[PDB]
Design a protein around this motif. Structure first.
Motif, PDB file in Angstrom:
ATOM      1  N   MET A   1       0.863  -1.176   0.000  1.00  0.00           N
ATOM      2  CA  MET A   1       0.000   0.000   0.000  1.00  0.00           C
ATOM      3  C   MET A   1       0.896   1.220   0.000  1.00  0.00           C
ATOM      4  O   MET A   1       1.786   1.322   0.836  1.00  0.00           O
ATOM      5  CB  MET A   1      -0.893  -0.005   1.240  1.00  0.00           C
ATOM      6  CG  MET A   1      -2.012   1.015   1.211  1.00  0.00           C
ATOM      7  SD  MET A   1      -3.241   0.683  -0.067  1.00  0.00           S
ATOM      8  CE  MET A   1      -3.530  -1.075   0.083  1.00  0.00           C
ATOM      9  N   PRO A   2       0.677   2.128  -0.943  1.00  0.00           N
ATOM     10  CA  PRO A   2       1.586   3.270  -1.082  1.00  0.00           C
ATOM     11  C   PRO A   2       1.465   4.250   0.080  1.00  0.00           C
ATOM     12  O   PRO A   2       0.456   4.324   0.785  1.00  0.00           O
ATOM     13  CB  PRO A   2       1.148   3.926  -2.399  1.00  0.00           C
ATOM     14  CG  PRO A   2      -0.187   3.355  -2.699  1.00  0.00           C
ATOM     15  CD  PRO A   2      -0.242   2.009  -2.085  1.00  0.00           C
ATOM     16  N   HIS A   3       2.529   5.028   0.266  1.00  0.00           N
ATOM     17  CA  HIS A   3       2.490   6.177   1.157  1.00  0.00           C
ATOM     18  C   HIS A   3       1.514   7.224   0.613  1.00  0.00           C
ATOM     19  O   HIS A   3       1.127   7.205  -0.561  1.00  0.00           O
ATOM     20  CB  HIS A   3       3.860   6.848   1.186  1.00  0.00           C
ATOM     21  CG  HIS A   3       4.969   5.983   1.700  1.00  0.00           C
ATOM     22  ND1 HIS A   3       5.094   5.651   3.030  1.00  0.00           N
ATOM     23  CD2 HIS A   3       6.023   5.407   1.069  1.00  0.00           C
ATOM     24  CE1 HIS A   3       6.175   4.910   3.198  1.00  0.00           C
ATOM     25  NE2 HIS A   3       6.753   4.741   2.024  1.00  0.00           N
ATOM     26  N   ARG A   4       1.122   8.158   1.481  1.00  0.00           N
ATOM     27  CA  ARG A   4       0.301   9.301   1.079  1.00  0.00           C
ATOM     28  C   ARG A   4       1.037  10.559   1.535  1.00  0.00           C
ATOM     29  O   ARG A   4       0.803  11.077   2.625  1.00  0.00           O
ATOM     30  CB  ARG A   4      -1.095   9.203   1.683  1.00  0.00           C
ATOM     31  CG  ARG A   4      -1.904   8.149   0.981  1.00  0.00           C
ATOM     32  CD  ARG A   4      -3.366   8.213   1.318  1.00  0.00           C
ATOM     33  NE  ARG A   4      -3.632   7.966   2.725  1.00  0.00           N
ATOM     34  CZ  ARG A   4      -4.821   8.160   3.285  1.00  0.00           C
ATOM     35  NH1 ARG A   4      -5.829   8.615   2.549  1.00  0.00           N
ATOM     36  NH2 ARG A   4      -5.003   7.916   4.575  1.00  0.00           N
ATOM     37  N   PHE A   5       1.942  11.057   0.703  1.00  0.00           N
ATOM     38  CA  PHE A   5       2.745  12.210   1.079  1.00  0.00           C
ATOM     39  C   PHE A   5       2.017  13.530   0.881  1.00  0.00           C
ATOM     40  O   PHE A   5       1.250  13.716  -0.075  1.00  0.00           O
ATOM     41  CB  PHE A   5       4.051  12.219   0.289  1.00  0.00           C
ATOM     42  CG  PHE A   5       5.045  11.211   0.768  1.00  0.00           C
ATOM     43  CD1 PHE A   5       5.699  11.402   1.969  1.00  0.00           C
ATOM     44  CD2 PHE A   5       5.323  10.080   0.022  1.00  0.00           C
ATOM     45  CE1 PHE A   5       6.622  10.484   2.423  1.00  0.00           C
ATOM     46  CE2 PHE A   5       6.246   9.160   0.472  1.00  0.00           C
ATOM     47  CZ  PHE A   5       6.887   9.353   1.674  1.00  0.00           C
ATOM     48  N   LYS A   6       2.288  14.459   1.793  1.00  0.00           N
ATOM     49  CA  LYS A   6       1.791  15.825   1.695  1.00  0.00           C
ATOM     50  C   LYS A   6       2.948  16.780   1.956  1.00  0.00           C
ATOM     51  O   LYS A   6       3.843  16.497   2.757  1.00  0.00           O
ATOM     52  CB  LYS A   6       0.683  16.092   2.731  1.00  0.00           C
ATOM     53  CG  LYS A   6       1.131  15.829   4.166  1.00  0.00           C
ATOM     54  CD  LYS A   6       0.022  15.993   5.180  1.00  0.00           C
ATOM     55  CE  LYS A   6       0.520  15.629   6.556  1.00  0.00           C
ATOM     56  NZ  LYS A   6      -0.544  15.809   7.571  1.00  0.00           N
ATOM     57  N   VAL A   7       2.944  17.923   1.272  1.00  0.00           N
ATOM     58  CA  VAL A   7       3.922  18.956   1.588  1.00  0.00           C
ATOM     59  C   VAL A   7       3.745  19.385   3.034  1.00  0.00           C
ATOM     60  O   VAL A   7       2.622  19.608   3.500  1.00  0.00           O
ATOM     61  CB  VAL A   7       3.771  20.143   0.626  1.00  0.00           C
ATOM     62  CG1 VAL A   7       4.725  21.257   1.015  1.00  0.00           C
ATOM     63  CG2 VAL A   7       4.037  19.714  -0.810  1.00  0.00           C
ATOM     64  N   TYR A   8       4.853  19.484   3.762  1.00  0.00           N
ATOM     65  CA  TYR A   8       4.813  19.748   5.191  1.00  0.00           C
ATOM     66  C   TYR A   8       5.838  20.811   5.571  1.00  0.00           C
ATOM     67  O   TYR A   8       6.776  21.092   4.826  1.00  0.00           O
ATOM     68  CB  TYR A   8       5.047  18.445   5.963  1.00  0.00           C
ATOM     69  CG  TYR A   8       4.498  18.480   7.360  1.00  0.00           C
ATOM     70  CD1 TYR A   8       3.138  18.351   7.587  1.00  0.00           C
ATOM     71  CD2 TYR A   8       5.336  18.619   8.449  1.00  0.00           C
ATOM     72  CE1 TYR A   8       2.623  18.392   8.875  1.00  0.00           C
ATOM     73  CE2 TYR A   8       4.835  18.651   9.735  1.00  0.00           C
ATOM     74  CZ  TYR A   8       3.485  18.531   9.938  1.00  0.00           C
ATOM     75  OH  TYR A   8       2.996  18.563  11.225  1.00  0.00           O
ATOM     76  N   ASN A   9       5.630  21.405   6.749  1.00  0.00           N
ATOM     77  CA  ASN A   9       6.399  22.548   7.223  1.00  0.00           C
ATOM     78  C   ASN A   9       7.014  22.146   8.548  1.00  0.00           C
ATOM     79  O   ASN A   9       6.299  21.891   9.521  1.00  0.00           O
ATOM     80  CB  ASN A   9       5.500  23.772   7.374  1.00  0.00           C
ATOM     81  CG  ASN A   9       5.016  24.269   6.054  1.00  0.00           C
ATOM     82  OD1 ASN A   9       5.671  25.079   5.412  1.00  0.00           O
ATOM     83  ND2 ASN A   9       3.866  23.769   5.624  1.00  0.00           N
TER      84      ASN A   9
END
Ligand SMILES: CCCCCCC(=O)OC[C@H](COP(=O)(O)OCC[N+](C)(C)C)OC(=O)CCCCCC
Ligand SMILES: CC(C)CC(C/C=C1\C[C@@](CO)(COC(=O)C(C)(C)C)OC1=O)CC(C)C
Ligand SMILES: [Zn+2]
Ligand SMILES: [Zn+2]
Length: 52
Positions: A1-9
Motif C-alpha cells: 500500500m503506497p504512502h500518502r505524502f503531503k507537503v509539510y512545514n
C-alpha cells in the motif's frame, strides 16, 4: 500500500528518511506521509520504497 505524502512545514531539524540529509529551508521543506509519518525531500518521494 503506497504512502500518502503531503507537503509539510518543519520547525525543528528533520532529516530525509530516504537519503539521510537534512530537509533545508524555512517552510515547505519536504513531504510527510499522512499514514506513517515518513519525511522525505520533494525529489526523494519518487525514490522511496512504496510499502507504507
Ligand atoms: C514566511 C516564510 O518563511 O516564507 C519565506 C519562504 C522562504 O523560502 P525557503 O524556506 O525555501 O528559503 C530557502 C532557505 N534555504 C536557502 C536555507 C534553503 O518563502 C515563501 O514561502 C514565500
Ligand atoms: C518556524 C519556521 C517558519 C522557520 C524555522 C524552521 C526551523 C527549522 C527548519 C529545519 C527543518 O529541517 C531546517 O532548518 C534550516 O534549514 C534553517 C534553520 C537553516 C533555516 O530545521 C529547523 O529547525 C527556521 C527559522 C526560525 C530560521
Ligand atoms: Zn507512509
Ligand atoms: Zn532525501
Amino acid at each position: 500500500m503506497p504512502h500518502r505524502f503531503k507537503v509539510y512545514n518543519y520547525m525543528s531539524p528533520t532529516f530525509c528518511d530516504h537519503c539521510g540529509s537534512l530537509l533545508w529551508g524555512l517552510v515547505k521543506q519536504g513531504l510527510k506521509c499522512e499514514d506513517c509519518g515518513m519525511n522525505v525531500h520533494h525529489k526523494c518521494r519518487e525514490k522511496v520504497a512504496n510499502l507504507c
